[PDB]
Design a protein around this ligand. Sequence first.
Ligand code: DHE
Ligand code: DHE
Ligand code: HEC
Ligand code: HEC
Lengths: 539, 538
Amino acid sequence: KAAEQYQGAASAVDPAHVVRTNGAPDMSESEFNEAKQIYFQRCAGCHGVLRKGATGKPLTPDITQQRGQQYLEALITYGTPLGMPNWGSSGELSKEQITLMAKYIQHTPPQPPEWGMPEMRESWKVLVKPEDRPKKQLNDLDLPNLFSVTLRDAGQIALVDGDSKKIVKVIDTGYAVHISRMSASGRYLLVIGRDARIDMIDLWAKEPTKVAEIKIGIEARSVESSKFKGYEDRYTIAGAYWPPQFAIMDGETLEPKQIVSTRGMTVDTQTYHPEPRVAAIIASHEHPEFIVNVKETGKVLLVNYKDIDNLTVTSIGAAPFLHDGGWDSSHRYFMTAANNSNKVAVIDSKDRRLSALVDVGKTPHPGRGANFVHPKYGPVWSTSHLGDGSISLIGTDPKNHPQYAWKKVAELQGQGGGSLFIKTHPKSSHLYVDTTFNPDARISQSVAVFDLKNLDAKYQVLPIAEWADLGEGAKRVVQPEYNKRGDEVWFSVWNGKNDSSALVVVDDKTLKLKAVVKDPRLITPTGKFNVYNTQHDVY
Amino acid sequence: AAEQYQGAASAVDPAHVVRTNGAPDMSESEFNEAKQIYFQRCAGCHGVLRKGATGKPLTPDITQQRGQQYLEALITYGTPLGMPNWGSSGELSKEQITLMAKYIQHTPPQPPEWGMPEMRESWKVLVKPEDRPKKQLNDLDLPNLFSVTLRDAGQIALVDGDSKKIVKVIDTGYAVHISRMSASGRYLLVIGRDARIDMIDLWAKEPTKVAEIKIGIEARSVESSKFKGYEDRYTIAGAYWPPQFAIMDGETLEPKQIVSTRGMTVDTQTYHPEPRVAAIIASHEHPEFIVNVKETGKVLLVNYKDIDNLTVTSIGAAPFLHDGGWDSSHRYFMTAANNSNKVAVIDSKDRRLSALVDVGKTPHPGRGANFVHPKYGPVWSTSHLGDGSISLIGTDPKNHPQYAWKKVAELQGQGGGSLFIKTHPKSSHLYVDTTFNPDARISQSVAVFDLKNLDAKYQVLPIAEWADLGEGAKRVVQPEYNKRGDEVWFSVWNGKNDSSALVVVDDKTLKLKAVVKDPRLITPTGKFNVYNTQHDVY
Ligand code: DHE
Ligand code: DHE
Ligand code: HEC
Ligand code: HEC
């Protein structure tokens, strides 16, 4: 009773300013669920789970009811020239369905489940204990030259032998694996699905097999391993889109250790954002840390794992909509794209500060980028764009080239916009650029190639999907990727689930077709990661 | 192109994202009537999103499962585990309780956020630092001044220690919770439960406000940078709503950084949507602030060496962190995890949790009471709300390792409902109030222990009776010494329409020394002696 009177006073919060949400149009269960289904299949991607993920005004009740039924239907029907597609004019959705979506977004956002340690541990499984694993490589595969390829819609990945061009093993994983990363020892391949399901694969087993698995959220895209001297296979980190968090697990067993929320204040307006999805994650070579990208808030977190019981995080402000990125040639500066802000943030991992924000083209999408030495400007890091056909070259040598450091030193012009990946290798005098989402089929099915030794000459167009000899289907070409020795570049001919796909290999020295990988198992091939190049960040 | 890039389906399954409702319909006046009772009577314990109390949360999933009648009965009779009885006591009507039962079955109404735009809008520089005096422009004994909170008046009074007179009364935020001093000893910082901060220059002809800002909707703590070379550099404040804390310029109060405390709990490691910020103490070992985050049980070490790239070290402790203070050496932060009945020891130098000491029922130390025990060496003590015990915890790892972080001994007071324990380097007494004890005579008096003879029972000083105030609850609260340590002040916290007073005792003789009355002295609660607060003398 004493403690009850102690905490008995009135809250300083005024009841009058605490608002009940409603005033939305009536819709039955059948109706609400149908809309909700359409929302996560078609809208959530850009707008997010809580509808504050896209640029412009959020789709929350305060705003939507202000706009009204008519405006919403009209907006959803025709779209806008700023990234919002037209669902009615295209014939994607029916007027009946648009009427439902307009009603739906006027309601409070249905809540998805949280996912903490109890859920994580429940999902955690150690298939083969560290003790029961081989002490040395039990097969005679050339592991460094192996290619972990994603068989997207199949919810699997295929290990492809570099030299033989044959599929060695097919493994079941989470749905639509987004990326593959390698442990610092080069022994374990880590894969994570969009469903946030991670799988640890042992390349030393007689036949490469899964030794651990866990689910770190409802939705995810990134996973990474400790790469600081003396931390080989110590920790594994993964970022989720929902819930807004990242989890640190044991590098050997995938046992969940810490889960950290990314919900917080934005860099630009410094207001609270309830859903800051975790984008790229890269491991620091200068300090025992993980460099995490937090999209909507535009923050780059340096999570120190030297002591994970008492986690130390340094929050660096960058720019809103942080997505992909990669290291500069020296592996000290994290060159990351803030695509909707049309900028590239430079994070110094040694000094641990934002070195600069470079202005670039419309919607920069560098992937991990492409590093090379410019004859005139010295070391540069480059990126292509989704918003245009330009390629930005940024100087990355502060020490010996201060005149060009962090400057969009020069540009190149590819086939057009819709570009996803740019690429090159130390031993190569070529630069590859795809155009996966370019609305012109001929362009989307081919890749441009520049001559690093004559940057003034126009690119050469390589007909990848055509060299595939596949037949009907979109046949979208995506992500150029070199082999261990960098004498050949691989491309994925991303065709439909019921269509035929392939992996095309070009002779880097001659720019001629060298091979074409086909297999009934190769369904919707997307990302490809050569074991050596991914592990040693060779790009 | 970008529309096809971001055009695939979300990995989130539509079938698992849930629409909330199935709640008892209620009109606007019914919902508002209930909502007003919730924030007047319930929010304190349960919180804004109803997950602040122990036991099950009052969210729709649990409430609708329990149902209408279960809820009404629970609200009507309460429970022996801290939930008051509203019907049995006759506080709420059967009609209102029914409204409350239906109300908690609905989604919790949302209070607004409070970011940088809102913060700057409230920010005001009343007197620019360049226009402020360069020397003390008055004859006041600043070190021995007491900053007294006149709770319901939304003001504070600066009382002269020796003269016992009200030197100045200042308008502030409502019900100021605490007063803190800057390291230079020039500025006094006060923050109201309404999250409104006020900076006061004691060097002006008449001590006056030079700056003000609002850092949330509800708050309790504020603090200034005390690391060497950082005198008056930054000012931090923690809020209850939103769940955040803010760092500002320590000269102008200009908002600089805002950090959300929403996160994962230390125990269950699950997501908590409302981890309120409790105590905050400035480190002397490193340039960092030590923040207590309640519901998640985390102690954050926020480094201000580079405010642009904020570094924060998260130390897990135990759930329900509240008040705390330094050990005699000013190196270990002794803080109470009140509902967990534990005191967490945070090593500010090595930056780690040194221990979790089991204590009595609901410990409430305030900043605590340090002193050297004849047998056990230097200890830190704390009283309780749940019982009449007083825990003495060893705080010397160097010379008394056998006693370090151990509940070395115990003392017994008049009973539970205690809030503060006090002593001083120059004093040989130990005072403990019992403010919320259900017995009028007990709540109106304090206990005093002889530190030179701890085996002996305590003496009871009749503080309220010495005040000669007449009717009213006359709750005595928080002992506080003067700069010399020979006087101990107490507040006689009566109603706003009643008469209150400040009683002063001669520490050397335990005899009444003075009584401070004044028509302006409305509902006096916290009292902060400038020197003692500034140099953490307790
Ligand atoms: C955050 C993020 C990264 C960087 C992770 C890292 O390196 O740590 C990344 C990288 C990648 C990489 C990494 C390549 C590399 O070289 O590192 C690939 C191949 C890839 C295949 C695709 N990505 Fe990706 N991608 C997203 C998110 C991301 N993708 C999306 O949210 C988006 C826009 C929408 C979606 O549907 O998920 C999206 C669409 C795509 C595709 O359309 C691709 C081609 C096929 C697919 O499965 O969706 N993304
Ligand atoms: C977080 C917190 C601190 C530590 C701050 C710091 O050290 O930086 C504190 C300290 C304090 C201190 C500091 C004393 C000290 O000597 O350090 C005082 C005087 C004080 C007066 C009161 N507090 Fe306090 N107090 C709360 C919160 C807190 N109180 C509550 O939430 C609670 C339980 C409920 C409420 O109504 O706010 C509460 C009730 C009270 C009271 O009932 C008091 C006596 C009168 C009032 O104004 O409500 N609290
Ligand atoms: C990304 C590829 C998108 C998808 C898929 C959908 N929307 Fe969108 N939407 C997107 C952007 C970038 C914007 C801003 C447009 C602008 O000109 O500012 C929008 C905007 C809307 C709006 C209007 C918001 C307002 O101003 O009040 C609505 C109502 C809207 N989007 C609805 C919506 C629905 C219902 C969608 C799926 C069926 C959907 N969007 C998909 C980006 C994208
Ligand atoms: C702290 C001083 C409290 C105040 C004021 C109010 N409640 Fe509370 N309540 C409190 C605790 C510690 C608990 C747990 C009690 C237990 O023995 O488990 C509760 C519990 C409830 C519940 C029941 C939760 C459940 O089991 O489903 C309800 C419905 C409840 N409290 C309602 C409620 C209302 C409506 C209040 C204000 C009018 C209120 N509580 C105040 C602590 C405190």
